[PDB]
Amino acid sequence: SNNLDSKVGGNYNYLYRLFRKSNLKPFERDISTEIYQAGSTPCNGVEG
Amino acid sequence: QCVNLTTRTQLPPAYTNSFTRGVYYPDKVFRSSVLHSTQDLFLPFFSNVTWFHAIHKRFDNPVLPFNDGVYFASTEKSNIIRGWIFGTTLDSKTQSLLIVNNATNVVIKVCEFQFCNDPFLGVYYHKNNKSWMESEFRVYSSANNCTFEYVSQPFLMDLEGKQGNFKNLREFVFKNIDGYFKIYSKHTPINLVRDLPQGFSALEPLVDLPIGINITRFQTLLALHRSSSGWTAGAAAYYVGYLQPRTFLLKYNENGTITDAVDCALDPLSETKCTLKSFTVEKGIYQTSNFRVQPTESIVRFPNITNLCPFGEVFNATRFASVYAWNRKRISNCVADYSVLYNSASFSTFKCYGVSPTKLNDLCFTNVYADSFVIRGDEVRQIAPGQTGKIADYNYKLPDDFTGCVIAWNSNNLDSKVGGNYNYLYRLFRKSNLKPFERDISTEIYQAGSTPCNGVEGFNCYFPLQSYGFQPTNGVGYQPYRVVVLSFELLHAPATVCGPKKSTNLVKNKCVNFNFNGLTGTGVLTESNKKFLPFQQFGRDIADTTDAVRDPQTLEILDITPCSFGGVSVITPGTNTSNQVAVLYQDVNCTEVNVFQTRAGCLIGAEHVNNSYECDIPIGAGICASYQT
Amino acid sequence: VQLQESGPSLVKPSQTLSLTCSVTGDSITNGYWNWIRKFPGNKLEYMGYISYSGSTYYSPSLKSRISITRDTSKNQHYLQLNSVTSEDTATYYCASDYHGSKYYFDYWGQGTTLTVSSAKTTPPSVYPLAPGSAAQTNSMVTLGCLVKGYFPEPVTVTWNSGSLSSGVHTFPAVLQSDLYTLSSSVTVPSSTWPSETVTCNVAHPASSTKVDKKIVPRDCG
Amino acid sequence: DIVMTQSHKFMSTSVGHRVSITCKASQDVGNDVAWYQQKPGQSPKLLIYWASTRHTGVPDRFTGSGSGTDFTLTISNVQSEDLADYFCQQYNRYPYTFGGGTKLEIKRADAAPTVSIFPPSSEQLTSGGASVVCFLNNFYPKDINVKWKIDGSERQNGVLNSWTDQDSKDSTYSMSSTLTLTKDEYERHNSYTCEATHKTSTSPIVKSFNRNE
């Protein structure tokens, strides 16, 4: 996939998921892009 | 869409009993003149179902769950039931399924529909020239992102308004497992006025809809008839029953039609038929299942209130060390309650880093190191990773992953005298930086220039151990705080001071779940009269069965009694005369579980008769039962 | 012990700040003198303090761009904040934290708002706000007092030298690219205006400008 | 650094209800928890010291408790004079990092505001300025939409809105909408109209004036 997806200067267009509270269920798509809290500290909006 | 009806009268959904509804074909296997047991989601017999109708004051469309599975059964006379809304959150944010029918084609589309406030369909202008033609389309607003569409064959359905009794019986099965929706249907004419019919009908599947989505809530559409908010409805009935993973016994005839179904979780008569796989019950005592008393809660008995940690010589001491020659103290093999250290109301500085103090209760550490040193008020905040000053770069530097605590108290009447306190010292000059957990007790004279100092002061030769200043003419916060820093880390050594769940819990004479040092189990802690040895902790039976233990920090003599367990024997005669049973549990008592005491258990269901008759069905210990007058 | 804050409210960036936390009523014997600023947006941050012994320590966000001196003769202490930025615009306060009779107490003062910006000093221009001649009649007539083109914050706007306090709704200021804008409203009955004298008093202590604009019904129909 | 985290930034409390102000800090502070009482336009004052004893001059309707990092400031008998900002702080060590603050809101019946748009005076037109101010007083709730209709066209640039805090006498709000325009723009239009959309009426308050007079 180096000659089909990569370009000059680097490719920084797509995203992925890194952190989650629990494990995923089998045969389920995770398209939830909402901002969720980690513990008892709410954020409710912008990042940080 | 936005206009809702105002003819809704709030009525309580009373309970309704079902006789034999909820029977359908489990799979694609055709059977005849046999008896096979299946495992699928079915409707339990004599369960609790809903009570809703479609009348011109009661117009209710409730929201019912779908995670347990529902069953649909409706008796119709004018084709009032149109369709359902299969969604997840009832909004335009998720993917939903909408199956409706405008009496021309079965509209099955998988799109992203917009859930309205109250969808309704009806026929307009019932005064003259009706012709049973519908024009109102108020089921949904829009439909985008369609991935599947099903169009059935065109037909003509009669939606005339009949009066009197019901003429149609339409039942459906609404379940979804592993992303495969299964829809069943069955239509037959019956005779019914008010109540629920006690009939029997097997439902056959029509189509297969592999939607692959999750359904949590659903509604039910109703038809409206009135001779845009004061419209009324006709007269219909529909019932919803929650599905459960039960076991049926489908009796097939020579043609393959299901004639009988028996739910094994309804009566003890069904436990005999589901065990021997035969409806014809012969004469004799038959074992069906095993009774077992479930435990109430889990109780761990590891710690007690004694054998505390030696914190009296650390927190209530007289003199401490300096910041360069501090002493490291290890605390282990005890139990430290963190609730009495928080509400002491005597510590002027109680800080913790890394983890919350309310979260370390269910978390075990293996190393506790108290680092006590005496500093000023301007040096407490420098005990932090990634900081600079006269402590983090000269005397004591914290590591990066430091999850310890800072404990100190006021020293207003301990280390404050008139004249000046020159007890403690601190290093002022140093060449390089520090390392985590490093002690520097050297008294080498700092060489600021190129000429040597030779241990004495001179040109660019200052004394590194500078003296502290404690005077009564100084500020309040400049008093020497006896800062004691706790250290925590994780190594290969096991934990010592963690605590399993709590201090102590004592519930006697009940079937509880204990947790010992080397064995687990469920039993009843009863009284005893023996005298055990004080150094023993456990005790076994002949063939390695734990029956008597001792608390490690409490001198008590208690045994371990197992709970009420045993088989279940159903005493019943043949089905050619009657169907009455006698509940008999084995190895039980008449207290924890028309009550008669037997030698095999507690017999509940049979009366005591002093007249001795002939033995018909054996029970035990010379007792027999007989179905006589 | 009474507290009073004083000093210039206009500090240019990359310069030396100057303040004076006046302590009247009791001399500095036992206790500290902190410095708490208030950012616009309900966010608070600590600045520093000074004692009567000779040990000064500040916030870790400011390494060496803050120095506080002391003077036990006139019972005053100055605040020198070097190399100020645009984010340092806040309302500066000074307080004290010291126990008394084995009980904790906390004294506070009034405080003043300092504006750190590169804008120039502009005198305010007060213009009256009169209702129209074809307006709807009512028993309660609303009046206004518009102040536009003043720098810096804050200003003191009263109504009839403080004698008219009922129905006074003080409005906060906004921030455009060049200046500020202040507005005010009052509620007078129909028998008061224009029968009585209604004049909002606008005072600007930073530019020494005092403009008294009489509310007149101009122009007529 | 000491992070002081509260529950919410804006809450609502009616008269007679019990509000539990919680400030769940990430780091444990012990029992050195104090709370502020900052009136709009004044300085914050001390309310509760050492989490067990009320201050001299404070009535007995202010209580405080908590265990661990989960503190609770129970405010009983919430009247109109108790409407102030609360800040969890600590006198342990410097710097005194404070919280974000929690503002209460007294709920009452919805009413219609008093919209009065005034023409610009003749003294402002001499210098070359023009500002139409649309006054809005005694409205509820705080969320409202104030738009301008100049000859059927909506104007966005030049609108200055400034809302006030909740009043401690009638639990209402006040604001001001100033339309900043030039002198030549004032002579090219005739009708100026500002409206106030309310939740109790489908039609907003239409207040306009004619420049011919």
Numbering used by the authors:
A (entry chain D): 438 to 485
B (entry chain C): 14 to 69, 77 to 247, 255 to 620, 641 to 676
C (entry chain A): 2 to 222
D (entry chain B): 1 to 213
Reported in the publication:
Spike (S) protein protrudes from the surface of the spherical virions and mediates virus entry into host cells. It consists of an ectodomain comprised of the S1 receptor-binding subunit and the S2 membrane fusion subunit, a transmembrane domain, and a short intracellular tail. The CTD directly engages the cellular receptor, human angiotensin-converting enzyme 2 (ACE2), and functions as the receptor-binding domain (RBD). Moreover, we captured an ensemble of cryo-EM structures of SARS-CoV-2 S trimer in complex with the Fab of 2H2 or 3C1 up to 3.8 Å resolution, revealing the MAb-triggered stepwise allosteric rearrangements of the S trimer to coordinate the binding of neutralizing antibodies targeting the SARS-CoV-2 RBD, also providing structural basis for MAbs 2H2 and 3C1 as noncompeting antibody cocktail.
To disclose the molecular basis of 3C1-mediated neutralization of SARS-CoV-2, we determined four cryo-EM structures of SARS-CoV-2 S trimer in complex with the 3C1 Fab at distinct conformational states, including S-3C1-F1 (with one Fab), S-3C1-F2 (with two Fabs), and S-3C1-F3a/S-3C1-F3b (with three Fabs). Among these structures, S-3C1-F3b was better resolved to 4.3 Å resolution, and the other three were at 5.6–7.5 Å resolution range. Furthermore, in the S-3C1-F3a map, there are two RBDs in the up configuration (RBD-1 and RBD-2) and each binds a 3C1 Fab, while the remaining RBD-3 in the down conformation can still bind a 3C1 Fab. In addition, we also captured the S-3C1-F1/S-3C1-F2 structures with one/two RBDs up, and each of the up RBDs binds with a 3C1 Fab, while the remaining down RBDs have no associated Fab. Our S-3C1-F1 structure also showed that the binding of the first 3C1 Fab could induce a further 32.3° outward tilt of the up RBD. Of note, compared with the S-closed state, the S-3C1-F1/S-2H2-F1 structures both exhibit an untwisting of the S1 subunit region, with the fusion peptide (FP) released.
